[PDB]
Structures are given as C-alpha cells and as structure tokens.
C-alpha cells in the first residue's frame, strides 16, 4: 500500500539536476526578491522583507487561516520573516522569535520595519530544548528535507510532538515537512481532534517539497487534502513547463509602533446617517466582521459582493506586434503585472493606507497656519471663488463614462442631487461615499462628485494654480512647457534644484492640513460658503469608504471611515495637494534660511511677526523658485542649507521617500536631470539652429504602457485606434527618441489613415491630447513647438521631419534606447513585414505606409 | 629685460607631456584625498573636505597669514573648500560663497560638516558682475592658467581690479595667478601701499603654476619673494625628481555650530594659582595672545619655547632589511607618516579636541545617576578603596623614564610632593598641570602623577576592573585570553554581538560623567576622601593644560583650561573610562529592552523605581553580556532591538564613529569577526586535536609598527634588541601568521642569541610582555598557551613548532598575508642572504640561525 506521496518522492529522486531545477518551480507562485536582496546588500533596515518567508506567511494571513494576535511566538524564526510581518498586524502586541543560529543555520537580521519595537528575536535557542510558554499565537516553520521519506517522517513527528504542548485555545501555523507518510497522517489526525485546524498547501511552496501547514482556523479531511497535493505534484512532472507566477514582494514599512495610538475614533453624528443608508440598501447581507484587519480606520460593517479585478492587465496586440524586441525586456512586461484583485487591494491598503501620522508640534502648526492664510490671500488677489453648475458639470461629461453621459441626461439624477444638497445646507450628509477600487448607488456616487465639483471645482476650472496666478503652479501649462519652466528656474541664482518625493502624499495629509486648506471659504459668498463648508466638514474631514476584502467565504465590501488623509478619489485633490505642498515647501525654505528654528517648532506660543515679515517681503520671490504640481515639487533655494533642513518637513508629516528620515537631500544643478511629473527634460538644438526643450523618460516605460489595452473586451478596431493614439503622442512629445519615432511611423502605417484615435493615452493633468486628430502630424508639431510656443521667437515653420531633432545618440541609449543592439537592427529591417501582418489582421482599409 | 618667471614659463611650455607630469609634482606638498573622494562618491556629508582647497587655505590660516573672522565672503567658492573650512574657525560668524557654476565650472557641494548652518553658497554668481559688499574677511581664489603669460597677465589684473573695492581694514587672502609679469608687479606694489599685506607661495601649489597669494597679515618685498619662487621653480626643472610630501587631509567634523555656546567659563578660584606659578616661572616671555584659536577651551596666556616634534617617525633598520617586500606596500610605510610637529598638534586639537558636548537631558542624567551609584556599590562589594604610597610608586618606576628613576630617588622631589599635598588638603592646587605633547617643571609634573596615583591608583593596582570583580571588565586578562572571553560571550543566547566605536571618547566625557565617577569617594576613609576629592574637583573637573602653537615668530606654549572632558594623560583614565562605558552600555541595554523610553529621557523628574528594579534583578546578568576595556566595548543584548536604541547613547554624548547619528548599528554573530582592543580572534585546531583562540589583526599594521625605532639616536644594538622583541612577540601571539613566524625566525637568527630584548613593543594594558626573555620561545609558548591557559584542559606540552598551527591559508591571505605573491616567494628564498646582511652590520657575536 504505497501512497501517492511516496510515488512522487520516488520520481523526484530519480530526476537529473537540470530537470529537477525546471520541475521545482513549474507553475508555482514566486515572489520577486531582486529589489529586497539589493536593499539588504546595502544594509537598508526599512521596508524590505528579510526573506521570502514574509510573503509566505502573508498568503495564510490573507485568507484568515491564521490571525496572529496578542503574544506571538515564532519557533525557528531564522532571519525573522514571519516575525517582522506579524509586528504590523492589528491585534499583535508582542513578537518573540526563537532560532538556533550558529554554523549552517540562519541568523536573525535586525530591521527597522514597522513594529520593530515589539519584536524580540533570540538566536542560540534550540526549540527542542525549550519549555513551552503561554502565548496567543504559535508559529513554527521547522522541517529539514531528506531524500529519505522515513528520515523526514521522524523529523516531522519530532516537530509535532515538540510543538503540541505550546497549543491550547490559541492561533497557530505549523509547517508539516512530510505530511504523506501514514504515521504522520495518523498523528495529525489525532492532533486535529484535540486542537482542531486543517492542513493547507501554500502555492509559494516549490514542487520539490510536499510541505503543508497545519493552521488553526479551518476544518477538513487531512487525508483528502494531502493526496490532492500529491496528485497535483505528480501531474506537474509530465505537465509542460510553465514559468512561475511572479508577484510583488511585501512592504513592511518603517518606524516604532504604538498600538494604543492606532485606533480611530469616528464622529458618529456626522457619518452615522451614511452608514445607515448603506446598511438599509444592502440589508440582506449586512454583517459585522470582528476579524476585519483595519488598525487606523474605523470599521462599521460589511455586505457580501461579487469579486472584482484581474491579476494582470490586458495587452494591446497592434503595438506589441510592431515592437517585437521588447517582448524580451523585463520592465516593459513587468508593467502589465498589476493587481486589482481583492487580495492586492488589501495588501496596498495595509502597507500604504492603514497608517497614522503623528500630530505636528504646536510651533509647526502655527507656521502652517500663518503661511496658509497668507497663501490663500495671494491666490485670491485677482480671482474670487465661485459655484460651478449642473450645466457646467454636464458639459464636461459630454466632452469626454457613457453611463455618466446617460446619468447627467436623466432628470431623476438631478432630483437626487437636489435632495442631498438640501441636507448639506442643514449640516447633514446622507449618501456621500467614495470607493477604493442598483443604479441608485451609481447615481449616489456620481451625484457626490457633482456636489464636490459644485463647491470646489472653481480651483480647477478657473485655473487657481496656473503659473500666473500661483507663481509656483504649472496648471494648464502642458508637458511641452514644463521643461522650459524648469530651465527658467535654473537661471535663478542660489542652491541646487531639489525634487524630493513624499512617501504616499495623500496619506500624509493631516487634520491641520485639512483645516488650513479649509480657509479658502472665508473668501466665498455666504451661499457658496455653506455648501463648501459642508464638503470640507462632512465629506473631507469625515470620509466614509467602501473597500473590498477577500474572506474564506467570498468577497465582502467593508464600510470604513477616517478623519484625516486625502480622499484620493475626489474633486479638488490636485488643487489642495498643490496648495499644501506650496505651503510646505515655503516652510522648509524658512528653515533652510534660519528663519525657523527647532526652538520655534517646539515653542507652544510662536511669535508671528518674524514669519509674517519673511512672507510679506520674500514670499512671492520664494514661490517663483518652485514648480509644484500636486505632490510633485521642484525647489531652488537661495543656498544649499535647504538640503539639511529636515525638521519642519518631517514634523509636518511629509516624510521623504526612499531615504533615511534625517539624511540630507541631494539635488541637481543640471536642470535636465531633474525629475518632474514623471519626466526629465532635454534641451535640443534643431539643425535650423533654434532650440527645443523636450520631455523624456525611460523608454521601456513608454513602450510597456503603450502595450496595454483599455476595455475588458478588445474589438481590434478599438484597440488599434488606441495604438494610433500612442503613435501620435510619441511623434508629438517623444519625436526625439529614435525607437519611438520609428515605431510611431510603423503604427500609423499599419492603421487606416481615416480612423480617428480613441480612448485616452493618459489621464495626466499635463496632457492636452493634441495628438488625438486626423490632421497631419507635422502640421500639429509645428503649431505646438513653433507657433504657440512662447520660448520660440523665430516662428519659421519646419517643412521636413528631418529638421526635427533626435536626442544625442549616447543620451538616447542612456534613457533606454535599444539602438546599437543586433535585435533592434533586425527589428528595423523587419518593419514593413510587421506592417503587413497588422494590416492583414485589420483587413481592407486605406493605408499610407510610413518610414 | 626678460624676467625669471618668463624664463620658467618658456621652459614649461617646451616640456613633453610625460616630463610635464613628473615636474609638476616634484618636491611639492600634496594632501591625500583617497579617503575623501570615496566618501564623497558614496554621498557622505560629514568630515570630508569637499576639495583639496580646504587644506590649501589651512596652510595660510595655520600661520596667521589670514585669520578669517566676522562675515567671510568667498569669491569663486567653487565646490566650497575654503568656505566649509572657515565655518569652524573661532571668530567666523557667517560664510557667504559666490561662484559661477554652469558648464565647465565647479558647483557648490552641500555638506553637513561643522558650521554648515552659517555657510551660504550661491551658484550662478559671476563675481565680475557683482557690487562689492561689506565684510570682515575677503577670500578669492580665481585665476585661469594659459600657455600665454600676457593672457594670464590681463586675467590677473582683472581679478585684482575686481577685488580691490571689496577690501578696507579687513582680512583677505587673494590668489594672484601670474605674479611675475612686470605690470602685475607694478599693480601689486601700488595695491600693497593702500591695503598692506604681502605675497606668499603655498607649498601645496604645483610647480606647473607660478601662483602666489596676496594675504593681509604680513609685510615684505613683493619683487623679492616673486623671484625667490621663480628661482625655486627653475631649480626644480633640473633637480632630480622627488616624490611629493604626503600629508593627511583635513577633518571638518559635523553638526550645527552655535557660536555663543562655544566659549568656556573658567573657575578662576580653582585654577588661578596654577596659572600664576607658570607665569612666574616663565615671566621673561609671558604674554597674552589675542589671536589664539581656542573656541571651547579658556585661554590664559603664553610663553615662548623651542620647537618639538618630527614630520615622520624613525625607522628600525634591522627589521626593514628582513622584510623587503613590504617597502612597496602603502599602509605599512603610511604608518610612519606621523606628525607631532606644532602644526600637526594644532590640527588634531582643532579637529578632535576643540569641541563641546551638549548637556544631556534631565531624565538621562537621572538614569546615569542611578546606574552609577549601583555600579560603584557592586564594584566595592568585596574591595575597599585604598591609598597608594611613595614606596609603591617608586617600585613601579624602578621596574620599567630614566629621569623618573632619578627623580623618585631624590628626596627633594618628595619634599615638593609633600608641599603640594598639603595644599590639596586645604582645597588648593598650585602646580598640577598636564600637557598635550627647569627640572622644577619636570618635578612638578612627575609629582602630580604621583598625587593622582596616590588617590586613584587603587583602581589599577587592585584590579577593580578585572572580570571577577566587574563582570564586564578584562583588566589583567591579557591579549591571549580576550578571544576566549568573546567566545564565552557568544554562547549567551540573544542578539548579535555589537562593538560600536565612540568618536573621540575622552572628549565626550561630560560634567555629569565626571560627577558620577566621583561617587567612589563615598566608600573611602576620611583622609583618603579628602585627597581624592582634591584630585576630582581641582585637577579633573578643572584642567590646566600646556599645548604648543606655531606662530609667525616661532613656537609658543599656550596655557588653556577645560572643565569637562577626560584628561587623557592621567592616572585612572582607563578605569574611569571603563566605569563610564559600563554604565553607558547598561543604559543602552535598558533602552533596547524598552525599560527606558524617549519620554523618560525628557521627563525632568524620572521615577527611579523602574530603573532600580531592572538593575537589582538583571544588572549583573547584563554586565556579563559585555566585554569592556576603556572606550572599547563588546555587547551581546537579549535581542537586536539594541541596534535601533540610539536615543540615550547620543544624548549622553557618546556618539558613534563613522556612521550617521541615527542609523542603526550593525553587529556580528560570528564572534571571530568582532573587533576588540585593535584585534579580532580566530579559533584554531591544533593537529593534536585541541583548540586555540588566537589574536589577529591586519598584518601590515604589525609589519609597519615593527619597522619603527624608539629613541632619537638609534645605536644599532639598541634598535636590534627592539627588533628581537617584536620577533619574540610575533612568535608568542601571531605564530599563526605565516609571514610573521618566518620573519620572527629570521630576526632571531640575525640577532645575537644572548642579547636581551629591550624597550617596549607596545604600551597596551593587555600586553604582559612574556616575550621579553632569553628563554626558549617554545617553552614560553607552552607555558602561555597550554600550562596556565584555563581554556586548555589537556595539559600535554608541545615538543615541536610544527604542531603549532597556522591560520587557514585563505584566512591568512584575507588578513593581509602576502603568501601567494611572487615577491613573497622570492623574499622567502632570499632569507639566509638577508640574515647574513644584518649579521654583517651588527658584527661578530654568537648567532643561532633559524628557519
Ligand atoms: N532545532 C532548532 N531550533 C531552533 N531553530 C531551528 C532548529 N532547527 C532549525 N531551525 C531554524 O529554523 C529555520 C527554518 S527556515 C524559517 C524561516 C522563517 N519562517 C522566515 O520567514 O524567515 C532555519 O533557519 C533553521 O536555522
Ligand atoms: N567669473 C567668475 N565668477 C565666479 N566664479 C568664478 C568665475 N570664474 C571662475 N570661477 C570659479 O572659481 C573657482 C576657482 S577654484 C576655487 C576652489 C575653492 N577655493 C575650494 O577650495 O574649493 C572655479 O570653480 C570657477 O568655477
Ligand atoms: Zn452628502
Ligand atoms: Zn531622457
Ligand atoms: Zn595640585
Ligand atoms: Zn585575522
């Protein structure tokens, strides 16, 4: 009576080493450790998982198979992957890791990831020599493989007997090295009757091991699940080899965790009615899940729902067939790797959104207060706030979602909007909810963006953050002007040009930020003020949110709430981000100039005379040293003390990304190397003698994004018109890139000339979409780059594309160009063949073939 | 009438490129930038000079040629070398740098070196377009060379005319590109009559440029000094090529400078009498120099003196001739590069000693207080403090300076000692002074170390910091036991082993440290207490110091004073350092364990119940996790939270070396890689089967130090007995190093067998000097490593050196062994030849030649 597991073991040991290497990863899920391993190689202590074990445990935790809580004990913690992961979980209060260490054994790696202060990893600790301790969660990942099943068998029994006394009425997750040996099966069955639980297989396990995990939250037949794994693994012997499914690795954050500072206290007076209506609308599946993971967001309930998302995006075929040598390159195809599944959403939420910012110091709040009041006055020197209207909102919708064009057309939609507006006037809010992913819910949602648009839309529609009105702003300028603005800034004497990224800007917006942004209502007419005051107080400073969550029993929709942070899916996000960033960068300039000291930040009663004088005499000039677009900023300070000015910036919550909190910033003096709005900008001399300033970025980012379809049902003609749109865009904005202009030419010749580009190449505020036309590209290029280009005085047109410059050939290569490679040369010769292939797929329309 | 400068220029332009490269550095002084350039390459912002310009300016500043003060303006600041250097000078309050920048021009580099907060470097600033500003110091280093002298001429005149209006009654240092053209000479002469000053040549200038500097503090004949430079440079054309004189680069420290927190306020009641006596003793040259450089030490006066020191140490010839292939290696000969000249002393003082530590927080002082009181009680549990005596002090002197053996023999010395002791009993101090480098001054000095020895010598003499008495200490253990103690520590379960170096420990000793170390007097007998109280209060907490300083008019001896810091040239330095370090590492362990929080450090009234309980229940066990020898420490905490525990350590002033202040520490789990007392320790298996634990270090450090003579008058027989001493030491402690045992064999065969080793191989407290004997080395080796080695149970002797193990051959190589190189092989064959050479120099004594 030989078991299937033993059959598998017999086949595995007979494998040559090469077939073994191919088999062990065939069709498995594998996390991408490339970034983390290089981070650890440089001694980084934040964000990185210390091993592949963090992701492995995460797979269990995601599915509520084990929910770490209270005192967590991690037997055989090794480098500490499981321990560091548990440190950030809601109900975990202490993590104790024991591991052997010494020669041939992994050692604990010290880290500063989130919750490090409740992690206690001890080496020199053989767990088979340890008396069991009281704990609320028991973890164990011990088990050393052997070519002999019976050797593994005794190792597995040893583990099980060691670990059994640690368990009683607590959570656990225990590795079972060899689960298919009859004596192990028999032992596990008796264990299951005392402590409950079930055996589960982790998809991240390699096929070279039959390992399964005894977890506490589940029931089921041990014998059955084991043989299901055995068959799965035997099947994968003969099954045609398939590459592993690559997932993104975990981000464990940074800093000390204070469990009691995490929970949210909601304003139930304000958000209560909204919950009640969601509850009424979904009463048939409404429930309260105590096992919700939310630490810093208040939880209010859930209802059941059909799942939504995809493990990776759709591919545009027309452009992928015209860019054959980019199938091979990593970062291109590793941009289609996207997860909007309920699992990926929860991962992003935990790692990025489920955080809390400490309140800024009293002196810091004073400075922000003074600066905000000054900034709003400056911004409203010429303009006044105004209400937007139904007709306005309707026009904008029509000129671009098709369900939205139907909704604004329905009078019943506007009756709902009116009803909710009357609530707002009374200080009440009934259906104002946003999401993180009947038609009554669709109407409730679109109706809410309208009421926001009505109250705060003036910031966008009336260009409050144009350069002329805000000095620092770049709204309405366009990607083809941004480079020129940075070049102009570089001419101002002083320090280097700095461009520090904030780590998750929207989550870093504080209660004090929100109350400073609110001050613009003091410039409003009374009836406008009451509507805006409703938006700020009821929906901005008290957000009610829908988010999907995977459960053992299907997907659910959680209703949660938060007082601070920025609702990212909202009208006014860009303008308010730009305003707060302007303010923040002014404050940092004050610090670098010595106007604002450490003593001032801590001083509970800061004197305002000093700040007011600096603003009234230097404020505007310092605004002109900056280019600010939402969370993205470029600052050129009067000197480089700015680099070391980190006190105010951190205390305001605007912690920089990918750099230690107190390490000085590093800038540029060549403006052409400064990153801004996902681009850098090159100065090019036309052979006509004149000069252009062009936007540029890593080419693979441009290639890969173009290879992504829109619409969950590509209809060839639709997906080709999108390919033409990227081609037109490339010829208008990235004409200087040799590979792109050649591929732009190829797409436009492989697509019918009369077909109009559809969909959107991008949703960037800086994109004016001049490329979505039937008009000749050289005539469009002339209009953009010569005619209405204010930094081009000689208005002489260009008659030939050969007077339109490329980048320097080394610079082209440096930014990702494949020019030089053999494959690129081959690809170039093969172009009219690939043209014919696309044209054959489309069919029989009018083509004009292009160089 | 062609000038000599023009003659030089004519010869320089006719040089081929290779002869040009040889000439331009022939016999010049050149700073070593290797460390700094790699530091900057990794983006380090502390300590490093940003260019070779910092050292260049330093040469001028050293000699009072220009003394930067008040507002300093740096024209053509470039990367900012001059500006960052000035930022740390006593009377400088603000540094403004202007430089052009842009293509082809140097750009300002942001740094966090000491005084960065008063440095304002602006780029995009052409100084020939700038209106002159008011300043107290004008710096300018502009001047672009040309093969044409007349091109340079107009460039130099342009500079001089630009810079002249910046000057009036202020300090300046101005580069004169081409000083030898007649029109420049004529212009400089008229400039000198209005603004004074003189032309000076910087030795760090290359021979490829005739550049000189117009400095404000000096007079002299311009024509003369210029032609003296011209002749010097012509001479260097034909002069046989000489390698540049390599100096150590500058260290500009780190952190913000607060000018008003720097000055020292002396206790004149206490130190007044001491100054008065130095003043009386040296009245004929006593003066008060207002141009003294001291920022954080109080200055009291100066007297004139003959210079003392040497630009590099003496070389031992016997061992250098037996180690021929190490003439070539850098770090060996770059260990003889030593500067005890008055110039080097001042550099070390400014960079390392002339600093100030901020007062620790009130909560931090409470913890240190509690821990110190507990530590002293533990240390005195078995022993009592006791007075040491004349007879004791005399015995110690005799058993090792020859002037000291004469002094303790003279009854008149002890009459002076008695006289001073009676002052101490009354709370007065008359002649208690130490130094930084008649016989009445020699007697005053030796008499002072006695009174210290008398009061605090018990700490050393009675082994208060032996491991048995202090748990953490290693006093009296020896370098051959240290490795075994670290191995024993590694067996204690918990975190990694940490060994963080403090940056200049002795300068980091605070007023609170001194007052905690003082508490041991509470365990003394009354008559002992009054003597010790005198030492602590009068000479430890109020130090009067002699230090040499170079001036335009010769060397002087400055009298300065300081309240805190540790007098490094003092009895009890090691014991008090060990005590304070033990205390500090206990405090850091409390923080890592969460017993001590940020709130506690800041809490002005910390509750002691928590600290006292941790000490009384865990104190000793935590002491046993450590090995502490003075400022050097090894800690193995209960887990690795210790790595991130930096709050208390920094606030106590014990800032770590070569690592950002708030970056987590990184440790070891292999105890054999842990650095301790300038060594690491390897475990070796004898072929007898038993194991040894041996001390090891980079071999070039052992080679180079052995190649250094003692005594400023090597008498061959004296310097050879020193070579034998290093040979004996190597065979006892570094027998495992293949190159060293072979070179040990060679020295002992090239030196007469009956000659006894003299002088000292080292002054380390861990050196028991068992190697200074005539006795057979294998018998000495047996006694040390088998007989009285407590970690060697099998006491079976070793009869042959071939049962004495070497390191693993890869490990030998890794630690600097030249085994494998061709030169090492050649060196090995050439040994009996080199033996014969040494023996030929010595003469005709009895040799025994050795393998
Ligand atoms: N007897 C024993 N006592 C304690 N630890 C042991 C042990 N036998 C093996 N181990 C350790 O258990 C570890 C299993 S690998 C565990 C990795 C960990 N879960 C992570 O995510 O990082 C190995 O590093 C091994 O050193
Ligand atoms: N016209 C001008 N205006 C301002 N700076 C100029 C200038 N012409 C040259 N310079 C700058 O002057 C510098 C001289 S090298 C100065 C180095 C500096 N003393 C240090 O220690 O680091 C060059 O970097 C050059 O860029
Ligand atoms: Zn509402
Ligand atoms: Zn580019
Ligand atoms: Zn005295
Ligand atoms: Zn070694």
Swiss-Prot record, chains A, B:
Instruction: List the active-site residues.
Output: 56 (for 2'-o-mtase activity), 141 (for 2'-o-mtase activity), 175 (for 2'-o-mtase activity), 211 (for 2'-o-mtase activity)
Q: Which residues bind Zn(2+) 2?
A: 680, 696, 815
Q: Where is the RdRp catalytic domain?
A: 496-646
Q: Where is this motif: SUMO-interacting motif?
A: 72-75
Task: Tell me what the record says results from residue 141 to A.
Answer: Complete loss of 2'-O-MTase activity
Phosphoserine, modified sites: 51
What residues does the record give for site: mRNA cap binding?
A: 9, 12-13, 15, 20, 24, 145, 206, 208
Q: So which stretches are on the Cytoplasmic side?
A: 1-851
- Any coiled-coil regions, as ranges: none
Q: Which domain of life is it from?
A: Viruses
Entry binding sites for Zn(2+) 1:
420, 424, 429, 432
Q: Where is this site: Essential for 2'-O-methyltransferase activity?
A: 56, 175, 211
Q: How is it modified after translation?
A: Sumoylation of RNA-directed RNA polymerase NS5 increases NS5 protein stability allowing proper viral RNA replication. Phosphorylated on serines residues. This phosphorylation may trigger NS5 nuclear localization.
Outcome when changing residue 33 to A: 90% loss of 2'-O-MTase activity
Localization terms from the record: Host endoplasmic reticulum membrane; Host nucleus
Residue ranges of every copy of the mRNA cap 0-1 NS5-type MT domain listed in the record = 1-258
Membrane topology field: Peripheral membrane protein
Q: Where is this site: Essential for 2'-O-methyltransferase and N-7 methyltransferase activity?
A: 141
What reactions does this protein catalyze?
A: a 5'-end (5'-triphosphoguanosine)-ribonucleoside in mRNA + S-adenosyl-L-methionine = a 5'-end (N(7)-methyl 5'-triphosphoguanosine)-ribonucleoside in mRNA + S-adenosyl-L-homocysteine; a 5'-end (N(7)-methyl 5'-triphosphoguanosine)-ribonucleoside in mRNA + S-adenosyl-L-methionine = a 5'-end (N(7)-methyl 5'-triphosphoguanosine)-(2'-O-methyl-ribonucleoside) in mRNA + S-adenosyl-L-homocysteine + H(+)
Role this protein plays: Replicates the viral (+) and (-) RNA genome, and performs the capping of genomes in the cytoplasm. Besides its role in RNA genome replication, also prevents the establishment of cellular antiviral state by blocking the interferon-alpha/beta (IFN-alpha/beta) signaling pathway. Inhibits host TYK2 and STAT2 phosphorylation, thereby preventing activation of JAK-STAT signaling pathway.
What's the subunit arrangement here? Homodimer. Interacts with host STAT2; this interaction inhibits the phosphorylation of the latter, and, when all viral proteins are present (polyprotein), targets STAT2 for degradation. Interacts with serine protease NS3.
Q: What is this protein called?
A: RNA-directed RNA polymerase NS5
Q: Which organism is it from?
A: Dengue virus type 3 (strain Sri Lanka/1266/2000) (DENV-3)
Q: What is the lineage of its organism?
A: Viruses, Riboviria, Orthornavirae, Kitrinoviricota, Flasuviricetes
Q: Which gene encodes it?
A: pol
- Identify the segment of the full-length protein shown: 2496 to 3373 of 3390
């Amino acid at each position: 009576g030989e078991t299937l597991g033993e059959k598998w073991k017999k086949k595995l040991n007979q494998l040559s080493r090469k077939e073994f290497d191919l088999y062990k990863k065939s069709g498995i899920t594998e996390v991408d450790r490339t970034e983390a391993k290089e981070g650890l190689k440089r001694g980084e202590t934040t964000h990185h998982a210390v091993s592949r074990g963090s992701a492995k445990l995460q797979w269990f935790v995601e599915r509520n198979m084990v929910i770490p809580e209270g005192r967590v004990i991690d037997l055989g913690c090794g480098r500490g992957g499981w321990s560091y992961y548990c440190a950030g979980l809601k109900k975990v209060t202490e993590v104790r890791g024991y591991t052997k260490g010494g020669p041939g054994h992994e050692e604990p790696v010290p880290m500063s990831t989130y919750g490090w202060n409740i992690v206690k990893l001890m080496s020199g600790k053989d767990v088979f020599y340890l008396p069991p301790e009281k704990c609320d969660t028991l973890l164990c990942d011990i088990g050393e493989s052997s070519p002999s099943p019976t050797v593994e068998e005794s190792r597995t029994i040893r583990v099980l007997k060691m670990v059994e006394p640690w368990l009683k009425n607590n959570q656990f997750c225990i590795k079972v090295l060899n689960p298919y040996m009859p004596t192990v099966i028999e032992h596990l069955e008796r264990l299951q009757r005392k402590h409950g639980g079930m055996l589960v297989r982790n998809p991240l396990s390699r096929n070279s091991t039959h390992e399964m995990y005894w977890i506490s939250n589940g029931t089921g037949n041990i014998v059955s699940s084991v043989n299901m794994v055995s068959r799965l693994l035997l099947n994968r012997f003969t099954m045609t080899h398939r590459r592993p499914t690559i997932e993104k690795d975990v981000d464990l954050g940074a800093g000390t965790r204070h469990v009691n500072a995490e929970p949210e206290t909601p304003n139930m007076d304000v958000i209560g009615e909204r919950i009640k209506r969601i509850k009424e609308e979904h009463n048939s599946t409404w429930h309260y899940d105590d096992e919700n993971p939310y630490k810093t967001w208040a939880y209010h309930g859930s209802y059941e729902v059909k799942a939504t998302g995809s493990a990776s995006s759709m591919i545009n075929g027309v452009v992928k067939l015209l860019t054959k040598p980019w199938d091979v390159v990593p970062m291109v195809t590793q941009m289609a790797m996207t997860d909007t599944t309920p699992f990926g959403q929860q991962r992003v939420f935990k790692e990025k959104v489920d955080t809390r910012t400490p309140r800024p110091l009293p002196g810091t709040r004073k400075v922000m207060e003074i600066t905000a009041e000054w900034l709003w006055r400056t911004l409203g020197r010429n303009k006044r706030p105004r209400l937007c209207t139904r007709e306005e909102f309707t026009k904008k919708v029509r000129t671009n979602w098709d369900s939205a064009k139907a909704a604004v057309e329905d009078e019943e939609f506007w009756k709902l909007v009116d009803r909710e507006r009357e609530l707002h006037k009374l200080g009440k809010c009934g259906s104002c909810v946003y999401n993180m992913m009947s038609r009554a819910i669709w109407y409730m949602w679109l109706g809410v963006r309208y009421l926001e648009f009505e109250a705060l839309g003036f910031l966008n529609e009336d260009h409050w953050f144009s350069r002329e009105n805000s000095y620092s702003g770049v709204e309405g300028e366009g990607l083809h002007k941004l480079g020129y603005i940075l070049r102009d800034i570089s001419k101002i004497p002083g320090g280097a040009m700095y461009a520090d990224d904030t780590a998750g800007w929207d989550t870093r917006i504080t209660e004090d930020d929100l109350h400073n942004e609110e001050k613009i209502i003091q410039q409003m007419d009374p009836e406008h003020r009451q509507l805006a005051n409703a938006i700020f107080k009821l929906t901005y400073q008290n957000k009610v949110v829908k988010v999907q969550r995977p459960t053992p029993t299907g997907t659910v929709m959680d209703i949660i709430s938060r007082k601070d942070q920025r609702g990212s899916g909202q009208v006014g996000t860009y303008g308010l981000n730009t305003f707060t960033n302007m303010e923040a960068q002014l404050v940092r300039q004050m610090e670098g100039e010595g106007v604002l000291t450490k003593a001032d930040l801590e001083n509970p009663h800061l004197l305002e005379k000093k700040i007011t004088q600096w603003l009234e005499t230097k404020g505007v000039e310092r605004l002109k040293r900056m280019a600010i677009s939402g969370d993205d900023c470029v600052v050129k300070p009067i000197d480089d003390r700015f680099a070391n000015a980190l006190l105010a910036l951190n205390d305001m919550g605007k912690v920089r990304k990918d750099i230690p909190q107190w390490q000085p910033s590093k800038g540029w003096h060549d403006w052409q190397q400064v990153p801004f709005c996902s681009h850098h900008f090159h100065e090019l001399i036309m052979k006509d003698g004149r000069k252009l300033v062009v936007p540029c970025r890593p080419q693979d980012e441009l290639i890969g994004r173009a290879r992504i379809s829109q619409g969950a049902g590509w209809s060839l003609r639709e997906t080709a018109c999108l390919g033409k749109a990227y081609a037109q865009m490339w010829s208008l904005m990235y004409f200087h890139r040799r590979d792109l202009r050649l591929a732009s030419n190829a797409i436009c010749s492989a697509v019918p000339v009369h077909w109009v580009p559809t969909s959107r190449t991008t949703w960037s505020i800086h994109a004016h979409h001049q490329w979505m036309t039937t008009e000749d590209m050289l005539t469009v290029w002339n209009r953009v780059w010569i005619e209405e280009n204010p930094w081009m005085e000689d208005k002489t047109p260009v008659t030939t594309w050969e007077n339109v410059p490329y980048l320097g050939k080394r610079e082209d290569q440096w930014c990702g160009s494949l020019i030089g490679l053999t494959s690129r040369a081959t690809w170039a010769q093969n172009i009219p063949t690939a043209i014919q292939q696309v044209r054959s797929l489309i069919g029989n329309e009018e083509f004009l073939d292009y160089m």
